[PDB]
């Protein structure tokens, strides 16, 4: 059975497998809270699952590579959205209204010559 | 500073001109250019004229300069004063 999804965000790539269950939630074979330490990451992961009142309807097994905690949380959200829509293909409109399937295309801007940061410049005294 | 793996450092011709010197007591300053060489307590009392850039300044060695190099007792920049 089961379904699959992939979520990418902020150089973070996550794979999600969805099976029947009640939402044990395993992050690289680890407890959800043992991974997400004192942050909203748990809630942002649970956002799309709870938007469709299916928190206890499924069990989730995921893995994550690359990026920071916020990027991995966003990747989990996107991946579980793409996995859930693969099961109940009538809620695509609901997620489109919620704007969860849409990927975040923002990415770090490269540094350029003559500048300190990607856009910061020196002070420019005129005399 | 130089590691403990190497105790002294002396110009070899300086070593030969000091070791041969001690056969007789202090009678003439010894002319030297290598400011880098260490000085041990075995040329104490000898007067060494160390090169400074335009002249050989003579300095009389004592026992209380074993741990300081030849160049420390010769100044190369004058700075007589702004006014």
């Amino acid at each position: 059975t089961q379904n699959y999804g992939t979520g990418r965000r902020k150089t973070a790539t996550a794979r999600v497998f969805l099976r029947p269950g009640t939402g044990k939630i395993s992050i690289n074979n680890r407890g959800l809270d043992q991974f997400f330490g004192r942050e909203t990451a748990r809630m942002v992961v649970r956002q799309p699952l709870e938007l469709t009142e299916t928190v206890e309807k499924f069990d989730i097994f995921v893995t994550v590579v690359g990026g920071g905690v916020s990027g991995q949380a966003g990747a989990i959200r996107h991946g579980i959205t793409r996995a859930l829509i693969e099961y109940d293909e009538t809620l695509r409109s609901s997620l489109r209204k919620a704007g969860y399937v849409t990927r975040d295309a923002r990415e770090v801007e490269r540094k350029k010559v003559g500048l300190r940061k990607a856009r910061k410049r020196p002070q420019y005294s005129k005399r | 500073p130089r590691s403990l793996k190497k105790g002294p450092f002396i110009d070899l011709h300086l070593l030969k001109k000091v070791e041969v010197a001690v056969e007789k007591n202090d009678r003439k300053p010894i002319k030297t250019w290598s400011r880098r060489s260490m000085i041990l307590p075995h040329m104490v009392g000898l007067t060494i004229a160390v090169h400074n850039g335009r002249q050989h300044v003579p300095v009389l060695v004592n026992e209380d300069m074993v741990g300081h190099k030849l160049g420390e007792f010769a100044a190369t920049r004058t700075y007589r004063g702004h006014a």
Binding site: - | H68, G71, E72, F73, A75
Partner: protein, 114 residues
């Protein structure tokens, strides 16, 4: 109470003030001579101030340390070596910038002529 020690402070911090002890050797004295670092020196018993006095008198402090640094400084000066002259004028001795930014060894700006 040592030599003009403060109170209401942890043992190591209080010990640090005696000019010859910092964070490391204060911790060593605190651990060796059995005392609680958490316990404030105010509530420490008289059984420990004598031990701390022994530890303080063991190494160095105050007058001897001032005298030996001053002896070293005059030792450098009287010979006439480069470092001695550098410390004589008050200019930096390690060899930092003197064209500018050598302020802590010159004082205020002291503008020209007047």
């Amino acid at each position: 109470a040592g030599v003009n020690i403060p109170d209401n402070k942890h043992t190591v911090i209080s010990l640090t003030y005696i000019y010859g002890v910092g964070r490391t050797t204060a911790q060593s004295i605190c651990a060796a001579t059995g005392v609680n670092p958490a316990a404030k020196i105010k509530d420490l018993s008289d059984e420990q101030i004598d031990q701390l006095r022994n530890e303080v008198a063991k190494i160095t402090t105050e007058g001897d340390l001032r005298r030996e640094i001053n002896m070293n400084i005059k030792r450098l000066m009287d010979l006439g070596c480069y470092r001695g002259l550098r410390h004589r004028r008050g200019l930096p001795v390690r060899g930092q910038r003197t064209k500018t930014n050598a302020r802590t060894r010159k004082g205020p700006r002291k503008p020209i002529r007047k």
